[model samples]
Structures are given as structure tokens and as C-alpha cells.
Target chain A: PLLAAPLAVGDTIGFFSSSAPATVTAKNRFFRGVEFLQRKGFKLVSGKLTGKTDFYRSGTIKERAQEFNELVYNPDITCIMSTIGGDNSNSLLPFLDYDAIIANPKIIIGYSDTTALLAGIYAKTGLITFYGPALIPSFGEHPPLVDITYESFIKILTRKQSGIYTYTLPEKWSDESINWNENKILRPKKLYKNNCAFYGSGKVEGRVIGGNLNTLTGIWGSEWMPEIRNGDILFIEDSRKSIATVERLFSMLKLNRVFDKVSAIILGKHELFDCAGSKRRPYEVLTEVLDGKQIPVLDGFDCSHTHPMLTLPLGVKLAIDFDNKNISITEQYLS
Target chain B: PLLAAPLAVGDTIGFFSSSAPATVTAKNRFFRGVEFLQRKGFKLVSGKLTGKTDFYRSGTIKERAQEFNELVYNPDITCIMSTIGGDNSNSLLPFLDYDAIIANPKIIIGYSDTTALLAGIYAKTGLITFYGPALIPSFGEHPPLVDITYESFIKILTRKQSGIYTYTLPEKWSDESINWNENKILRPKKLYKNNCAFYGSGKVEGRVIGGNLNTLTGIWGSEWMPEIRNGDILFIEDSRKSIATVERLFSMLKLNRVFDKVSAIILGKHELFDCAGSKRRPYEVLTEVLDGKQIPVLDGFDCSHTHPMLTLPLGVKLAIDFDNKNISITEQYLS
Candidate 1:
């Protein structure tokens, strides 16, 4: 396992668009996110594809890979984050500069489609990557939500923990959709009180693995996909997916014998899940798929596509105290 | 590989709703398809869940699997076919009766989400499965289109081939969406002349493997997924997916080193592919993902979700003559 040095306040953080052209498509939100980070005493560097657009993505696959590689090669960049997540991040895997990532191990972070890169880099170079915020989506949100997300990001990455780092659940969360490009707020999003459930007894500890369940399918059988070993706690979440799609994904895990190997599961809160009028939540779908597997489950964790996202370091030790209903990072993630 | 006996006119075809509840959802079309096969002198039998539905799926995972298993165990059923394909077929994988399938090898056929069952069955039991027309979507089509699809199905399964069987491209095809449940004769769908392209020189002979590209992701790394050996000819198709998703799927294949192993590729016509306003075809996205790989490719074949679909047996030897611009089944797919 490899760890990058803890991020300092004045460090330079470079942001790249590996998939969606958020910097071009959501200009207002992109600038807001950049300013949010810059005001936190960090120097922000924009990737080459920041303002470029090629249809649904930021640029071509090679172009995106080159932009990311440039950031990884930069000695001044302490962290490399994604501008936004889209459906095509897996397209850049083959062209990524894994050697450079190994040589200069800097913090890599993002969620959603960026799961491909975070998981792929960890698998290839053993560099622990962050399953956390993207530039436009997390940091750009208005007011309290964005502030909570930033606090988690800073707490997780900016300081080295001498002891167990327990994750504090945010008081509220939201997945309400509105106009993303418009600078003016239509109204404050309806928020829900956190009701994360712990569905097992006692404590379970294992190496944490996985990210965006839907994006994981893109690299599931590839060399870039980390070998999910016995006792690894699978961390998976999806956004805007139908119940049928969710059922199939969980079944894929069952077919692959993941349920038999994993010690426990951490299901991050799904954002705006489509239940196809069945009113079935993701955990219900998973329970049906499990067919009485009896695995410990931490349902509705905050490290997902929802507002006030928590930062998680992929490929690290995590423990779930089911009796106490708590989750903690049991290992130091920074050098 | 196991092969089922060639279909006789008096033989029975057991139909099941593996995923979508087509019988209940498309009542008129369902009866139309049943009558179409009955007129051809084949006895039609419906599986237990034929008319049942649980919201987005035909039934629960175990219920769907039981429906399929009952058909497999029936001695009178010479063939087993899916009513239609949907998102939950993969969910039935774990509960399937593979042992019964091994003991009673039958001609199992369907495309789209049914790819999971067809591929999984072949992987588990070595039974050659067909990537062919589903009941409602193919046989229920109005007039001319349905007739062409029937002809191909009959030609492929009804008799033994004494010599090499070459695929005869349909004169026209359509993927236009209309009211499926209504018996009203909507205007004839717009048809396009066959433009299936052969993109390399010389013949490439190898074992044919693969089904719906999107559905393939569902069983990708599992024991149910057939290993793509070196020199295999991959046959893949999809429907109603955006170019971004297409690019990611192709990249998944590349990351797994599929391009390096397969001698050639047979890309079936994408039914109503969303190009995301770029107007780029699936082949174009594949080409970008290939990135200078000189694998022989046959773009826009007829065995897909489009109307007038051809039947291709999975897990059989196939030869693609690029110079002659033809595809042929060199080995027998039936006993």
C-alpha cells in the first residue's frame, strides 16, 4: 500500500475533467467550486481540458488521459481531483500514466464515474485514492451543504490521524435536482435527516474496497479492477439508477461470489434512485438479492452522491461497530 | 459442446418471461407471436410466470428461475425461448437449474437481456445457445418484417445443414418504436437498405462468443461468463444506449485485453443508439477505443435488437470472410 503525504493548506491541487465537460457545460458551478477551494488557502490548477468539450465528455479518450497525466507529472500538484463524473472515465484507463502516478504519489480524489480512475489507479500503482468529492458537484453546492462536504474533505485529507478517525454523520442530506448551470438559486433543496442504519451485531473490520456500483461495471473484469479478497468490506453506491438496474448489479456481485468472500458491506446512500413505482430502496433490492446471506450491512452511509458527502480513502482498513452503530478509519491513510 | 436436436414441425417451444412480463404488458403482441409460431406447426407452451409481473420484472428472481427450470425439465419442450428481454435477467443467474439444463439440452434462444441466460447456460453446461429473436419483439412484428425473421429462425433451427451455411443479409430492417400492445396497424416502419460493412482484408476463422454487449457486463467476470480464448470471433450488440456508455463498454473490453486476444469482431446493428448529438456510430466509438489495433471488424451485422434479426448460435465455430464480405457457420450448431 502507498500513501501520499498529508495535504497542507497552501498546497496546489490540480483538477481535470476525465469524463464530463463540466468546466465548459456548468461554468458557474465550476467557478464556484474552484473559488470554494481557493478560499480555503489552497492553490488550484486547471487541467488542459477544463474549458474544452467534445460532445458529452470533456475531450477524446486520449486527450482526457493526457490532461490527467500532465497533472500527475506535475511536482507542484499535491492533489489531483476530477472536475465532474460522467459515463466515460473508464475509457481513459488504458492510456493513463500509471508509472508517473507511482513515481509521484499524490492524492487522487473523485466519486461517481471517477470511481473508475480511483479504483484503477489503486489497483495499478497501490496508491490509495479518495472516493470523495469532485470539483463541480461537491464544492460548487451553495451554502451549508458545500461547507459540510468541505469540512469532511479537509478533515480526511489535510491532517494525519494519530488514532481512529470516526466518521460523523452530517445532520442533513439532499439529492434534489435543479438547474446546475444557473448561478441563481431557485430554492433551497429539501433536506432529510440522516437515518443511516446498522443491520448487524458486534463489530466487523476489513480492508475497504469498491466505489460507484454502476461505474464499477465498466471495469469489473479488467486488470484495473482490484481483486476483491476475502473479508474485504465492499463500499458501493449508485446515483439515478432504476430498481431493475440495481437488482441486476447486486446479482452480478452474487454471481461473482462476492457475497461469500466479503466480511461486510457498506452501502452508501443512493441519490435519487428510481424505484420503478415499487417504492423499493437499494437495501431492499440488495436484501432480496442476498437471499439471506447474513452479511453485516451499513446502510445509507454519507460517502455517496448525496449532498454533504464524506471523504473515504479507498484501499485502507475500515471498521464497522454494528453494536455502537459507528464507522471508523482504523489505519493512517497519509504518509 | 452440447447440441440439441434440430427442431421438427411438431416439436414444442416452451416460452418463459425471464425478465419482462411481455405476455401481460404486451397482450396483443404476445398472442400475435404465439399464433405466428402455432401457424408454423409448432406447439407453444407458456411457462408459469408468462402472464405474471412484479412491477418492472416478470417475477422475483427465484420465481423467474423456477419458470425457466420447469421448461428445461419438460421432455416435450424441444426449445426454450424468452418472451422478451429486460434489465433483470442477470438476477436469475444464481437461482437457475444448470444441472437440469445439462441433462436436457434444448435450443435456448433470445437476445438483449436474455444474453445473460444464453451466455451463462453455455458457460456452465457447454450447451450452445442462440442469440436470436425473442417472442413478442420479433414474431409479433407486422407482416413483412416478421416473415423475414421467421424465415431466418426456421432456416437456422428446422433442418440440418449438410454443408457450410452462410448468412443471407435481410433486404431491409427497422428499429422504429410503436405501440406494442395495440393491435392497430400503425404505418409501416421506415426500413433501411443493408449497409453492413466489412472493414478488413482476408478471412478470419474462429469460435464465435458474446451476446448483447451491455448485458455481457452483467456476467462479465463471473464463472458464468465464457472465457474469450485467443482467436475467437466476438459478436456483440446493444440497444438504446448513449455514445458515452458505448465508449465505456468498449474501453472495458480493452482494459481486459479482449482486443489483443480476439482475431476479429462482429458488431451487430445497434437498435436506436443515442449518439448524444455527435452523430457518431457505435463503430466509431469502438474505433476510438481500439486506438490503432488492427483487428478485423465486421460492422453492422443483422443479429441484434433490430427487426428481421438473424439467428447466431453462441459457443460455435464461425468464419468471417472479409475479402468475400460474408459470414458463415462452419460447424454444426444442432445435433
Candidate 2:
């Protein structure tokens, strides 16, 4: 089994721009995130593509892959995070240094389009990558929100050996679009009560699989993708997608017979979802596509593109206690 | 071999809204398309979702599937054309009545997001589906443009028997976005001269595979997606996509080793391609992702989301004569 030492305070965390040039375009947020991590007793290392831009992405495909490799080779770094997620991370998947990653296993973490990297690393190296915050978006946010994200990040990565962790749902969350680059604090962001639902009666235990649903398509059939097992727990989320797009993506899983394999599904809270006037949530779209199939679903889980995003260990065993309405991490993710 | 007889004059052509409610939203364009088909000595039939709308789509998932199935089961209908393409055609892939389609074959055609259905039908029923124009978008166009599209549609689908057919490039084509719902001609849509490139030197023969690169991701890895085998010709196009998305998609092909298997590639004209300030064409992005791999490529073919669209069969043998700068249908498509 591949493993990495638990991340601790004062450990070095390296950041890379795998897809978007958030480090360049959102410099203010990037540095603020660095400052936040420093205040949390951590040392930060910037990847090669920091402050570099080539139109939509941080650099060319080779440059992006190189940026990631440099971080993978850095012995001092315990965690490698993304600057932000964008539309093209999958471009770097083929050129990634998977052998080096396997040789030097570390906690690789990111969300959104970075699903490509997280799932790719897990599939290729058996490394338990984190589906958590990135530097520009999650760590760069304002006070209370950023604290919640940091809490989740540190809580998951710093656990002791053979430790079990039960997730505690946040009191409230927000997907409100506030431009982080904008200097001023806008009006207080609106927050909603947590509405996570568990739609089954008994316990469902299995390995958790999946990340951003839309991003999964970019690496679906390749060797980099992990095959869906017979009873794995599928966790997926998306951001700013329309109901139609959600339907198409869910239908993709259905057509692939993913519904036939998974024991339960965990849907993360979608950030600013366009209901398309259908008044339907992402899970509602999944239920419709399911068409009378009874699959246990945990909807509106907080580990997604929303504020206070919880960190999840991909490929780790998870137990969803539907009767008691709880989720627990049941396996070791780090050494 | 699975085949559908050629569509003929006075035959009934049924239109279905598998995703978008184009029949209700684009009333003027829909009727104009019907009028055009009627003038071509054909009878028109509307599917169940013709005038229906459930917010963003024509109907719910089951309703959409039912609409397509109704047209599939109807013995009177000889051709099934999509009223338009939208963001959710993949939703109907699982519930599609493939048995009925295989038992009663008919001409099925559409492009853009409808590529999901075209590729899905071809994959499931082994019936050659057309990557051609839709009703509201293609048949509803003004003037000589509509006539050219009609010419190609008729020239291909109405062939008398098994014979070779070579495609002739249109004098000009357009991807201009005109308000089709508005009565005006919209100031005579701008056109561009054909600069389609043939990037290799020898003739390459293979089975034609793929459509709408973006849409392909929806049904990708599913049973609905035909496996791209050795010596298959990759044919794909996209509209209104950025260079980042194009790169990511092309990288998906590369990671899946599609570049290693396919003998040649045929890229259709991108409709309103946004280079994202990179000033790169779709083919340019493809070249970069190809990363010095020498694969035969025919870029900017007319069979895409553009004016004067060509009708090409999805599962037929295609010969790309790069030496002669031509593409030919070298195998039988209909019986």
C-alpha cells in the first residue's frame, strides 16, 4: 500500500497550477492564501507555473507537467496542492510523472477540474489524494469561511495512524459568487441551512470513488481512470452547471452501468447550479435518470465547490449510516 | 449487415425534440424547415414532444425517451431527424428502444449535441447514423445556404444503390449566429472561403468514427459509444468551445491511445470557435496535443455545426486521400 506521513504544522506544502492560471490572474488571492497558510504554521513552496500564463492555462502541457514533477521530486514537501482548477488539467495527465509520484507518495489535493489529477494520481500510484481546497479559491477566502476549510484540511491530513474520523456537517454553507480578486468586502454573503439528505434505511459501506462529475469525463476511459468496483461508494459534485448538463453527466454514469455497481452515491453540494427553471437539484436529476431504480443517495454533502468545503480521501473506505444519518471514515489513508 | 433503405421522395420524415424544445421555442424556424422538406416532395410528421416544453427541455427524461421511441416504433416514418440539438440528448441513451430501432431501421441524422444520439444509435443498433444538419438550425437557414445543405442531404440519403461517392467542398460556408426566430434575414450572414487543410501525404482507408468532440464526452466509455478500433477514421467537430476545452478533449483522445489506433482524423468546421485570446484554430490546438505525433489529419471538413453542412455516415468505411486532397465514401451505407 502506498502512503505518506501525516501533514503537520510547519510542514511544507507546494502549490502547482495544473490547468488555470489562477496564480497569475488572481495574484492577490494567491498571496493571501500563502499568508493564511503561513499564519497557520506552514511553509509554502510555489510550483514552476506560479505567476506564469499562456492564455487560458498556466503554461503549455509540457510546462504544466514539469511544474507538477518538480513538486513531486521535492523531498521537503508533504502536500502538493493546486493553485486553482480550470478546464484543461486533463491535458497534463498523459505527461505526468506517475513513476516519480509512486516513488515519492504525498498528499496531492485539489477540486473542480483538478479531479483529473486527484483521480489520476490515485489510479496510477494508489496514493490517497485529497478532494479539498486549492490555494486561490478555498484558502484565499475571507475569515470564517477560510477557517472552516482549513479546519477540514488539517483535520483530515493530521490524523494519527489507525484513527477513525466521523464527519461533522457545517452549520451553514454558501456558493455565492463573490469575486476574490475584488479588494472590498461585498455585502455579507447569504448563507443557507444545511439540507443534506440520506435517502436509504440501513448502512452502506464501501470505498469512496469519484470527484467533480463533469471533470470525470475528461479521463473516463483511460488507464488513468480507476474502474468502478461492484460496491464502491460514488462521490461526485459539479459547479455552475445547468440542469441539462447535470442530466447529461448523470446519464453518462447510468449508461456506463455505474449505477449497477455502486452501493450508494454521495452528491456534493453544487455551487450556483442553474436549475433551468425546472426547480430540480442535481440529485433530482439523478433520481429522474435512475427511473425507478432504488439506490441509496446522500445529497447536498459539503465536499464540493462551495464555501467551507470538506476534504475527502479518494479511494478510502467509507461507511454511510443512513438510519442514524452519519458518515465515517473506516480505513487508514496515511502512514 | 444492419442497414436502412434510402429515403425517397414522398416518404414521411418524422422530427423529434429529444432534448431542446425547439419546436415550441423556434416556431418560425421549425415551420420554415417543415416547409422546406415539404417542397422537397416529402411528408412531415411531428413526434410527441413537438409542441411540448417542460422548462428548459421538451419534457422529462422518460418523456424524452418516449418521444424518440414513438418515432422509432412508427412504421410510417422513414427518417428520424432531430428538431434541434441541446445540452441533454445523452439523457435518453439508456432508455432508448434500441431493439425497435434495430428491427425497424430508418435514416437518423443531426449534429452538435445531437452527436450523442447519432453515435449512440450507431453503437447500439449498428445502424449508420448521419452527422448532418438539424431542422431549426440547418434546414431553417436562409437562401442558398439552406439549398446547399439540402443538396448534400438528398445526395447522400437518396442514393440509389451501393456506390462510391466523393464529397465536393462548398464554395463558401458560414458559422454566423443569426436570430432565426426573428423574421429578418439578419443583414446577410458573412461567409468565408474554404481553407480546409489536408495534413498528410498518402491515402488512408478506415471506418469513420466520432462526432461533435464535446458531445462525445457525454456518452464516452458507455456501451452507447462505439469503441474506436485500429485503423478507424476519427471525425469530430465542436461549436462555441474555447481552446482550453479543445486541448483537454484532444488530450483525452491521446491518453486513451486513440492517436495510436486511428489511421486518420477528419475535423469538421468549428462553429464560432473561441480561441480564448490564443488566436489558435481548433486544428492548431489538436496539433499541440498531438505533440509531434505524425497522424494523417483532414482539418476543417464541412460536416459540422456550420452552413452548407455535409451528411456523413458514422459507421461506414471512409477513404481519406490526402495526396489528392479528397474524402470519399468507399463502402455501402444503405440497402
Candidate 3:
């Protein structure tokens, strides 16, 4: 395990679009996110492909990789964040400069399709990567939710090492999709009261791994995918997927014996999950796939594509106290 | 490797719904398909979950597995096929009776989501499975295309041990989504000239493996996924997917070093592929992912979701005579 230095108030954060051209397509939201970070006394560096687009992606595979690589090689960039998640982040995996990442370990963070890069970098270089906010979607959000997300981000990354940190559940959260590119809010999103369920007894501690379940498929069965060792706590979530697709993914884990190996699982809140006319939640689908496997499960954790998301460090030890209904980082995630 | 007996004129063909409840959802098409086979003198046996549905799937995982297992265990059944493909086929993988399959060794076949079952059965039991037409989607098609698809199916499964057989490209093919359940043909589908590209020289012979590329992700890392050995000829195709998704799937293969191992690739024609506003074809995206890896490629082969689809036996030795722009089954797929 490797840890990057704690982020400072003035730390320069380099942002890149590994897949989606959010800077170009969602300029309003992109600029809002940038301005939000700038207001917080952080210096922002733009990646080469920030405002570029090649149809559905920000650029070609090689172009995307070069943009990310350039950010990694820059000495002044203390943190690297993604502009947004899209379908092709895994395309940059083989071309990533893992050695460069090792030489200058920095805070790498993003969720969704950026999971490919986070997990891949950690798998290849043993660096702890964060599953947290992306620029356009997370930081650019309209109000209280975005502020809450930023609080978690700062609390997780900027705080001095204390060897232990317990996450506090936010009062509310949302997965509503609106006002993404518009400056004015058309309507207020419906926020749900936090009801994350910690299902199990006693406390279980293990190294935490995994990210957006859908993105994991792209890097799976490859050297770049971190091996899910025995007792690892698997954290997975998805957004805008149907119940059928979710079932297949959960069943995929079952077929590969992932449920058998992991001590516990942290299922992040799914964003706008399409149940496909079924009333079953993602956890219910997972339960069916598990077939009575009694692994500890923390359902609806905030480290997902939802508003007021929590920051989670991959490859670090995490403790889930089901008795107390608590999740805590039990190891140093930063120097 | 194992081979099932060739289908006789009076053989019983058992069909089950592994995922989609096509029997219930597309009753007209389902009955039409059954009549088509019945007219050919083949007896049809419906599995337990034929007309059942559980929301997005045909039935629960165990129920679906039981349906497939019953067909596998039936001594009088000479072949097993899927009614249609959907998202939850992988859910039945763990519950499948692989031992029963090895014991019975019936000709198992279907494409799309049935790729999960075909690939899984072949991987676990070493039985050659067919990546061919499903009941509603293939046999239910209108007119000339349906006859052409049937020709390939009968030609592949009913022939006596010929040792070698070359594929003859159909003059026209269609991926048009029309007249799926209705009785009347709204209009004749637009057929394109057969322009299946053979992008290499000389002969390349190897074990042919793979089915629907997207479906493979569901079983990719599991024991049920057949190991892609060196010099294997990988045959993969997809339907109705955006170019971004296609790129991710191809990059997935690349990340896993599949491109490094496979001697050749057979890219089955993509059906209704969404280019995402870019003019790049599936093969072009594949070429970019290859990144200069010089593997012989047979692009736009007819053995895919496209109408008048060719039947290809998975886990059998295949020879690609690129010099003559031909693909041939070099080994017997049936006893």
C-alpha cells in the first residue's frame, strides 16, 4: 500500500476527462465546479483534452491516455481529478504511466467510469486511490448537496493523519438528474432521508476495494484489476442501470466466487436505478445472487454517484461495525 | 472435447427461456418458430418456464436453471435451444447442471444472452455448443431470411461427419427490427450485399471460442468462461450497442491480453450498431484497440445477430483461409 501526502488548501488539482467531454458538453456545470474549487483556495490545472471531444468520448484512446499521462508527469499537480465519468476510461489503462505514478504519488480521485483508472492505478502501483467526487457532476451540483460532498472530500483528503476516521452519515442525499447544464435550477431535487442499512453483527475489518460495479467489468480478468483477496471489503455501486443489468453483474460476482471471499460489502447508493418494472432494490437482487451467503453488507453507502457522496480510499483498511452501524477508515490513507 | 449426435429428422428439440420470457412476450413469433421446426419434421418440447416471466427475466435464477437442467436431463431430447436472449442468463450459471450436461451431451445452442449458457457449458463440460439462432428471433423471422437462417442451422447440425465444411456467405443479410410478433410483414427489410471482410492473408487454424461480446462480460472472469488459449480464433459480435460500449468491451479484451494470445479474430456482423454520431465501424474500433497488434481479422462474418445468421460451433477447431477469403469448420462439431 502506498499513500500520497495530505492535500493542502492551496494544492494544485489537475483535472482530466478520461472519457466524457464534460468540459465541452456541460460547460456551465464544468465552470461552476472549477469556480467552486477556486473559491476554496485551490489551484486548478486543466488537462490537454479538457474542452475536446471526438463524438461520444473526449478524445481517442491514445489522446485520452496522453492527457492523463501529462497530468501525472507534471510536478506542480498535487492532486488529479476527473472531469466526469464515461464509458471508455479503461481504454487508457494499458497506456498509463504506472512508473511515473509511483515516482510521484498524488491524490487520485473520482467515481463512476473513473473507477477504471482508480482501480487500475492502485492495482499496478499499489497506490491508494479515492472513490469520490468528479468535477462536473459532484462539485458543480447546485447547493446544499454539493457543499456536503465537498465537506467529505476535504475532511477525507486534507485532514492530518489520526490513524482512524469514522464517517458521519449526511442528513440527506439525492440522485435526481436536473439542472446539470443550466445555471438556474428548474426544480429542487427530491432528497431522501439517509437510511443506509448495515446488515450483520459485530465488527469486521479488512482492506477495502472495488468501485462502480459496471466500470469494474472493463478491467476485470486483467493484470490491472486488483485481486480481491480473502477478507477484502468490496465496495460497489452503479447508476442508471436496469434491474436486469444489475442482476447480471451481481450474478457475475457470484460465478467468480467474489461473495465467498469478501468479508463484507459496501453497496453505494445507486443513482436513478431503473428497476425495469420490478420493485426489487439492488440489494434484493444481490441477495438472490448470493443464495444465502451470509456476508456482512452495508447497503446504500454514500461513496457513489449520488449527491453528498463520501470519499473512500481504495487499498486501505476499513472497519465495518455492524453492531454500531458504523463504517470507519482504520488505516492511514495519506502521509 | 465432446460432440453430441447429429440431429435426425424426427429428433426432439427442447427449447427453454433462459432469460427473456419471449414465449409470453412474443407469443405470435414463438408459435411461428415452433411451427417452422414442426414443419421440418422435428418434434418440439417446451421447458418448464416457457411461458413464465418474473419481471425482466423468464423466471428466478433457480427456476431458470431448473428449466434448463430438466431439458439437459431429458433422455429423449436430442437438442436444447433458448427461446430468446435477455440480461439475466448469467444468473443461471452457478446453478446449471454441468455434470448433467456432460452425462447427456445434447446439442446445446443459442446466441445473444444465451452466450452465457453456451460458453459456460462448453467451458465446464468441454462440450461443443452452438452460437446460432434462437427460437423467436431467428426462426420467427419473415420469409427468405428465415429460410436462409434455417439452412445454416440444419446444414451445421444435421450433416453426418464430413470432417471439413466451408461457409458460403449468403447473398444478402438484414438486421432490421421488424415483424417480431405481428402476423403481417410491415415492409421488406433492407438487405445489404454480403461484404464480410477477410483482412489477412494465408490460413489460420485454431479452436474457435467466444459468442456475443457484451454477454461475455457477464461470465468473463469466472471458471465458467472458457480460457482463451494461444492461437485460438475468437469469434465475437454484438447488437444495438453504442460505439462507446463496443470500445470498452474491446479494450477489456486488450487489457486482459486476449489480443496478444489469439491468432485470429472473427468479428461477427454487429446488428443495428449505434455509431454514436461517429462513422467508425465495430472493426475499426477493434483495430484501434489492437494498436498495431497484427492479428488476422475476419470482419463482418455472418454468424451474428444479423438475420440469416450462420451457425458456428463454439470450442471446435476452425480454419480461416484468408487467402481464399474463407472460413471452415476443420473438426466435426457433431457425432
Worst 10 residues of 3 chain B by lDDT: B177-186
Q: What is the C-alpha DockQ of each candidate?
A: 0.87, 0.84, 0.88
Per-model fnat list:
0.89, 0.87, 0.89
Q: What is the C-alpha lDDT of each candidate?
A: 0.91, 0.89, 0.92
Residue B127, candidate 3: C-alpha displacement in angstroms: 0.5
Q: TM-score of every model?
A: 0.99, 0.98, 0.99
Q: In candidate 1 chain A, what residue range of length 10 has the lowest lDDT sum?
A: A178-187
lDDT, candidate 3, A114-163, per-residue tens: 99999999989999999999999999999989999999999999887876
- The TM-score that candidate 2 achieves is 0.98
Candidate 2 — which residues are off by over 4 angstroms? none
lDDT of each residue in A97-168, candidate 1, tens digit only: 898888999999999999999999999999999999999999999887999999999999976668999998
Q: Native contacts retained by model 2, as a fraction?
A: 0.87
Q: Which pairs clash inside model 2? A: none
Tens digits of per-residue lDDT, candidate 2, B52-156, equal 898889998788889889998889999999999998899888788999999999999888888999888888889988889799889988888998999999989
**Interface root-mean-square deviation for each candidate?**
0.8, 1.0, 0.8
For model 3, the superposed segments whose C-alpha errors exceed 4 Å read: none
Ranking by lDDT: 3, 1, 2
Q: How many angstroms is residue B328 displaced in model 2 relative to the true structure, after the best TM-score fit? A: 0.9
